[PDB]
Amino acid sequence: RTVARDITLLECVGKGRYGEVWRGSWQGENVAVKIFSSRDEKSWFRETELYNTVMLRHENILGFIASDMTSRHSSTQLWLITHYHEMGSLYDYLQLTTLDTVSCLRIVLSIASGLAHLHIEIFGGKPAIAHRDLKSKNILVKKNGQCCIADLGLAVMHRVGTKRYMAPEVLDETIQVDCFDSYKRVDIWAFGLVLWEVARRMVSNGIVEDYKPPFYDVVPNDPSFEDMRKVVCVDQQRPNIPNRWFSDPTLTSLAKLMKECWYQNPSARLTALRIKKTLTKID
Ligand SMILES: COc1cc(-c2cncc(-c3ccc(C4CCN(C)CC4)cc3)c2C)cc(OC)c1OC
Ligand SMILES: COc1cc(-c2cncc(-c3ccc(C4CCN(C)CC4)cc3)c2C)cc(OC)c1OC
Ligand SMILES: COc1cc(-c2cncc(-c3ccc(C4CCN(C)CC4)cc3)c2C)cc(OC)c1OC
């Protein structure tokens, strides 16, 4: 039989230290192709090892298609091929868009749903998985208004995370590294930051905040590990909740939720399943 492997690369939709992401075509359908830098080969190996262990399938997890290694004259080429989401990243989308109550809740509940799916061990099933680099650039927006979580290159089953989103126990190096629940609690911290980024863009009473990344007001661009440790660990700062949120029942509830993802004590933080339940009871 014919195995039509050929993917056509059409347009570059992202370039970084990781490598590049392209919109490609396979058999008349868009696919996303991540081409890894030599610098980041371990991320390809880790995501490939995870998908060889468990074929995750969930509407809020970026859909796997293929992992390809191709021998070149003097190098190895590494591609990850996934579903393509033409609306792009949540980071991209929030710059560009304000939200209403329904669209804000649908975004955050879809992220919580993908995250709880990663975190839960299913017997018969899947191992429990922590993401370890959750952020708005690692979330894609789908046409149906839900999101999906991308990039399992740092994931752990039972490179460091983006410093802006690191939990206090990562920055102060107290994290219990032999305890898998520690990694779930680091993802919950990061989720709370994402929830804050999104909520800012939800309109209430004709008011909205401009898009800003977490801690925009207290650290530089490309903040150092020390910059983040001083804010998060030493001073114990948390993102600002604007007064205008307290006139809106949805934003009032989301402010409480994000506070319960940001406790200094990792074991006090809400679980992804508890976050889901709370979000289903808002509005
Ligand atoms: C090698 O590389 C790539 C291959 C493909 C691809 C193209 N046509 C057909 C296939 C196919 C799938 C599944 C079977 C099954 C059929 C049932 N039987 C009991 C076991 C075997 C056979 C063939 C594939 C996998 C796409 C790629 O990119 C999207 C590839 O490159 C990454
Ligand atoms: C990698 O990705 C894609 C692959 C394909 C594709 C191409 N040829 C053959 C297959 C296939 C056929 C049959 C079996 C099964 C069915 C019965 N079972 C009991 C055992 C064997 C598995 C696989 C597929 C899935 C299509 C895709 O899109 C339409 C793909 O996505 C881009
Ligand atoms: C985060 O991580 C990964 C993401 C993706 C991915 C999947 N669908 C779509 C995209 C995308 C498409 C289009 C735009 C822009 C371009 C045009 N316009 C200016 C606005 C929209 C942005 C982004 C991406 C980047 C794939 C990945 O792997 C294959 C990723 O790595 C795991």
Q: DSSP per residue over 215-264, as a string?
A: TTTTS-SS--HHHHHIIIIIS-------GGGGGSHHHHHHHHHHHTT--S
65 lines ligand 1 (CB under 6 A): yes
The answer to whether 257 and 173 have CB atoms below 8 angstroms apart is: no
The answer to whether 187 and 119 have CB atoms below 8 angstroms apart is: yes
Which helix (H) or strand (E) is 14 found in, with range? Answer: strand 8-16
The DSSP output letter for 67 is E
Count CB atoms within 10 A of the CB of residue 182. Answer: 18
Ligand 3 residue neighbourhood (C-beta within 6 Å): 13-14, 21, 32-34, 80, 82, 84-86, 88-89, 92, 137-138, 140, 150-151
Q: Where exactly are the structural domains of the chain?
A: 1-86, 87-283
Model resolution, angstroms: 1.3
260 lines ligand 1 (CB under 6 A): no
26 lines ligand 2 (CB under 6 A): yes
The answer to whether 31 and 82 have CB atoms below 8 angstroms apart is: yes
The DSSP output letter for 6 is -
**Cα separation, 139 vs 92, whole angstroms:** 10
Q: Quote the tokens at residue 258.
A: 């994000």
The answer to whether 136 and 169 have CB atoms below 8 angstroms apart is: no
- Closest C-alpha to 43, from 134, 128, 139, 159: 159
Residue type, 61: I
Whole-number Å distance, alpha carbon 7 to ligand 1 midpoint, is 13
**Cα separation, 111 vs 135, whole angstroms:** 11
Residue type, 49: E
The DSSP output letter for 69 is E
218 lines ligand 1 (CB under 6 A): no
Sign for the pseudo-dihedral over CA of 272, 62, 95, 201: negative
Any known ligand binding at 14? yes
The DSSP output letter for 75 is S
Whole-number Å distance, alpha carbon 190 to ligand 1 midpoint, is 37
Closest Cα to atom 29 of ligand 2: 27
Q: Is 33 helix (H, G, I), strand (E, B) or coil?
A: strand
Active-site pick, 40, 68, 100, 133: 133
27 lines ligand 1 (CB under 6 A): no
**Cα separation, 195 vs 200, whole angstroms:** 9
The answer to whether 61 and 155 have CB atoms below 8 angstroms apart is: no
Closest Cα to atom 11 of ligand 1: 3
Q: Quote the tokens at residue 73.
A: 């004259």
CA distances from 161 to 83, 134, 155, 225 (A): 24, 8, 10, 11
**Cα separation, 214 vs 241, whole angstroms:** 12
DSSP character string of 110-162: HHHHHHHHHH--B---B--EE-S--SGGGEEE-TTS-EEE---TT-EE-----
Phi, psi of 151 (to 5 degrees): 75, 90
54: number of CA atoms within 13 Å, CB side? 22
Q: Quote the tokens at residue 259.
A: 């506070």
209: number of CA atoms within 13 Å, CB side? 18
**Cα separation, 173 vs 254, whole angstroms:** 29
**Cα separation, 251 vs 270, whole angstroms:** 18
Q: Is 92 helix (H, G, I), strand (E, B) or coil?
A: helix
**Phi-psi label, residue 242: left if phi above 0, alpha if psi -120 to 50, beta otherwise:** beta
The answer to whether 240 and 217 have CB atoms below 8 angstroms apart is: yes
**Cα separation, 152 vs 238, whole angstroms:** 27
Closest Cα to atom 1 of ligand 2: 65
Closest Cα to atom 26 of ligand 1: 5
The answer to whether 68 is a known catalytic residue is no
The answer to whether 77 and 183 have CB atoms below 8 angstroms apart is: no
